[PDB]
Amino acid sequence: MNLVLMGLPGAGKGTQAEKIVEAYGIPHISTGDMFRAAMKEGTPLGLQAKQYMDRGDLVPDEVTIGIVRERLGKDDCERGFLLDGFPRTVAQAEALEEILEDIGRKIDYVIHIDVRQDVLMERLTGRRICRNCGATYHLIFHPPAKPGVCDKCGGELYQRADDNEETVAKRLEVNMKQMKPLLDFYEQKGYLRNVNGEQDIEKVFADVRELLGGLKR
Template sequence: MNILFMGPPGAGKGTQAEYIVNEFHIPHISTGDAFRAAMSQGTPMGVEAKGYVDKGLLVPDEITNGIVRERLAQPDCNAGFLLDGFPRTLQQAESLDGMMTELEKKIDVVFNLVVDRSLLLARLTGRRICKSCGATYHVMFNPPQHEGVCDKCSGELYQRSDDTEEKVGTRLDEYSSKTAPLLDYYRNKGVLKEVNGEQDIQLVTAEISSILRGLGE
């Protein structure tokens, strides 16, 4: 089962990806992990990427595509994979199609977790972190016993600078503008499955599981 996972920041992709990986015994491939592995292993594409990273430059698409292809060609992907964070553009999606043809694979399903913007803002701006021990809380979903105070060490809780409403809103706008064409691309291919990410976690998992088991029949 070859799966693409899409959804905005805060949609809960990480939780659902963990379930899929454990239930279906396939590797979870993120572009960040693939980059780090390629560079540490000194693969041809990893060496090229490191040259750009060391200079503080953006890695060109052709190298990003090459690193993803190297990863998808590894033996642990023979039974399937969960790809997260790629593609991000139509050009990358078209390149992925080419990789799949070369590797004699195909994308079976593309999941998109759908969550209202206001809820995403609440999820992403509610995180609080202890300055002393690093414990993480959420004002809505996992609040401390006393506001602003860590339960574990009584340290002061703070909000990260990139968790502010303004910065989170910018991230969501950027994601939406870049992703809309991709959703149409996969919708037209008939492989897009949109899942209500506002449900309880267990219900989201159950819906994803039902779709995957239906595909496997």
């Protein structure tokens, strides 16, 4: 399974990626996760990315493409992979085609989790994640068994810096501008498939398993 997840900030991509990885054993590759880990470590790329992420802007194309090229060339990607929130621009998608031609690992399907913008502010301001393993919760929609504690590793939950009302409105504007050109790129390829993201979390995952059932595991 060679897969991409696309969708607006807060649509449910991370939530569904956790369930796909647990079921099928393929590597989870999230560019947002990679940039936040680098920022916490204080590396030159992490400090560059921080200026863009704090505002709600996208990180420039070529440095982003470069970290993806290197990750996908690893041995653990031989029998499949899941890209979560990359690509984000048509220039990223064009580069990704050339990378996969070269290593012989072409995309099976692009999964678009479709959610309208009027519900996304409430999704993002109540999001809480695990400091140690990244597991995703929501104080109203999907709370942990014990308050402030991860169900998976027992670590402390926290609110991301970028999940504030002012930075969320900027993220929605920036990412919406890229949606129609990216969706048109993959529709013309023939392997874009749509999922209704405005359902219960377990029903969204059911529809995702139904999409993926024709692939070898």
